[PDB]
Amino acid sequence: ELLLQTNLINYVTSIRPNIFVGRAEGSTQYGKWYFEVMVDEVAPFLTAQATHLRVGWALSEGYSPYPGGGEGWGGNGVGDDLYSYGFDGLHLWTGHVARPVTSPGQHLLAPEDVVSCCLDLSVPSISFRINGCPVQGVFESFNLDGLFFPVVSFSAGIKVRFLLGGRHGEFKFLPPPGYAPCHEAVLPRERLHLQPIKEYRREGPRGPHLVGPSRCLSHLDFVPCPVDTIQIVLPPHLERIREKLAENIHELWALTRIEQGWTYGPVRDDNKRLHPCLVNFHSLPEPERNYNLQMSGETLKTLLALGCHVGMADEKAEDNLKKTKLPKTYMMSNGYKPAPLDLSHVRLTPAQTTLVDRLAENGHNVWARDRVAQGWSYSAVQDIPARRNPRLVPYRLLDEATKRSNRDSLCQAVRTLLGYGYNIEPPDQEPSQVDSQSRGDRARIFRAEKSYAVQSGRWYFEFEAVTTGEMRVGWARPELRPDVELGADDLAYVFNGHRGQRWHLGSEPFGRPWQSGDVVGCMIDLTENTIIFTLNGEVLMSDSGSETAFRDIEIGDGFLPVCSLGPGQVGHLNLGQDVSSLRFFAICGLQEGFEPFAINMQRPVTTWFSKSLPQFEPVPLEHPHYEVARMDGTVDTPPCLRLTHRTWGSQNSLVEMLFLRLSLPVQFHQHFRCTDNRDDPEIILNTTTYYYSVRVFAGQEPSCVWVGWVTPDYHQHDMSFDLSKVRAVTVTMGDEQGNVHSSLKCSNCYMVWGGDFVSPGQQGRISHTDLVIGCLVDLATGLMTFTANGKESNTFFQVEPNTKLFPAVFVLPTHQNVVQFELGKQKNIMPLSAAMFLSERKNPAPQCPPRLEVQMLMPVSWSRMPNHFLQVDTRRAGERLGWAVQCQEPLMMMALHIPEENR
């Protein structure tokens, strides 16, 4: 528990199909899904550690198992966090806890085993079947704030196959009634295939490509959100047109019908191309003419709702408008020619075209919302009897074919309006910065290891931009921070060629933007203290015309190659170990005397990257905003750790969620026991209950404070935190015929909201008193209770033996004095120190040793990149065999384990 532990562990990696399913209010996605995994080969012990193979489901946002070491002893796969739920033949895995699950003929997943996974988002629940035999266990009541995808996690030595139904793997067992094959969940714009998850690295023709974050859909992206139109009231001067617009669109529609070959006939015979409605709009039946009259009215009403200004301009143009002549051949049995008004003169402006796009989107979204209300859902394969459609998805996710199929009709409609002579002013498109992500924390930074820092000489390296988006490349100081944008501070001199800027302590125009395939050559000359950039061999010049990009550079501790890729970006960093691989070194730099950065290194240069997994780190002693004071105990107060906001109530003040914990955990016992104000010696010396309080200072709104405990695997940097955001799941085990034997609740955050203890009358008014929330834990029974101002609360929790819990406080500061960890005690209740430190196990005197300190959650941190990666082969075996994943070459790593943090 004190010395760091070491051990050799297998590398573990995850593979999924690009299938995403979720739930949301009014979503267009079906609820029940089913898939299978068949195991062809497994080597139980390819290395000294047992082979890893787990199958199950995972949540889009949150399941980010990076290669190397993570929670516990590394090798993180399905079920090693509260975002994934896995099965390994013998155990249900979740939250890094394995719970044995009964099944006929139990055994670890072996060759020729078929695992059937069922996900019912209605309950919600996840269930398994092994070789058709039910697995007597279920996951339920888990969070539904993302998209779920099938996943298999594995170590080297496996060969398996996803069976997704249809032409993507024929199921070996019949899906349970109501569940849908997962091959139906593939989005219209995508093609089914197997991919890794949250990869920062891949292979490519000339070497490894570095990859930026991947843009992921949200479960709310499937909710059609059209603009309301019923409250719109049609104006009379639009009403007059409404009719003629209906007739004109009908003329065009019938023209297209006859072009495609439609003939007039009394009944819907598409086989013979018969068309009773091919008759004139005036001759068209009244219900149908009215139906068209509506769609027209909705078109104009949507035009109004978007904010478009529509106004009569020229009646002379309306008079001039002439119907195009129709060939006599176009005369079908309708006995009518659908004459359209020749609108050739009319030209659409680019803003008008964007408007047409918006009308098409709104119309499609309205239709989709209506169908969802009827009870329809999306499906790659149409099924009219089942109310499953291949188009029932929000417009943004539709394939280009249908999108243009709609834009054509909408553009013709607006053309008709303009021809009738209407000024059509698009709304002022007020900029709306989406800022969906934190820019500083979004782009992933890849840098060379600090030990490679160069302090003299003339060095060169190359960076090919596979994509053409946001990427920066250049030289960084060893102390570069991971959460700051490159060049936003003084620690990096970089070039951002999406718009052609230099970055150091800010941006400046420089150079020209690259295109796909362009190679930027970065040179640093430490004899002249300059930095030069070349694009495809040609030096990039400033506006002033200077060849150098930066000058008067202080050497300091040296420089490192660095790059940053934004979401969806791909680069290729060539440090020049193989001098022949460099593409423009000879053209510029070789004769100038620059040396490739890694010219004479036996081994490839190690790199580190900015991992976006929030981690708890001690509060920096020089933090610009947060200060922690270690208050000594007195005769009337216990030891305390007080938090204050230095920059409160001033310009530059930072006000955001703050997630704090204490450096040391309390650990529950291995076995739980079977079923005036002076401490009583025997009670205090035989008690297993421990206490600590949090004082929320007056002026700090209790509604912005959460007090309690966290487990070692809390990694949520949620700026809008609520107790509803806490990860939770229930694992239920029973017999063959139900009869639940056990139902365990698993979570990583056990807290009480400060708003629960605000008096209903006091609500809405600031208070002048402090709020003291006390937390009690019985390490021998697993029970957790809370009190507020001495009054017991109704919130209680139950944890399993061996659970580690860190005291924690989540707060949004609203005052200079925020909160105070009070490490005191109660009558016959021991302080935290007695549970945290073995030497103090029987010492009732509260203490706060130096090791106990306040830590805050930091969103990004540096992480070493493995020098070698698992070689996974994914391929479509066949229309019946499914999609095969294979991994045969073993790969191990020596892992250093911090006992107290369980990572």
Binding site: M541, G545, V579, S580, A586, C588, L590, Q591, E592, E595, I599, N600
Partner: protein, 144 residues
Amino acid sequence: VGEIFIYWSKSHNFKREEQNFVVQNEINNMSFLTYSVQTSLIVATLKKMLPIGLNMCAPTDQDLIVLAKARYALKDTDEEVREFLQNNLNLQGKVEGSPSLRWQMALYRGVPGREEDADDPEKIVRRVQEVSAVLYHLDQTEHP
């Protein structure tokens, strides 16, 4: 271009005449590139052509280039430097001496057609003398 730059450096009236021309005509040298010695096209053109000159000097010849630069500092004529190199054909950068002369030399061999060249001691002396003179005068120019 190198001989023209050498004349620009040696002869001194030519400098005033260039400067007077540029100032009197108010022709912006920066516009042509994209007043001062840097703006002077005589040195700029040679700085642009220099890589093409260094490219005919094999990496092994760097030490000879330094020696020739020393002679030109001693103010020897071109013939004197030519004879100096001719007799001191030795003192040629050895590949085993440093890794730099290994990877540089490998890359230089890589270029097609660079196998028959450097066979001729007269050829080596030609190139070293020329590039050394150019570099020497460029040094004087860049650092007054």
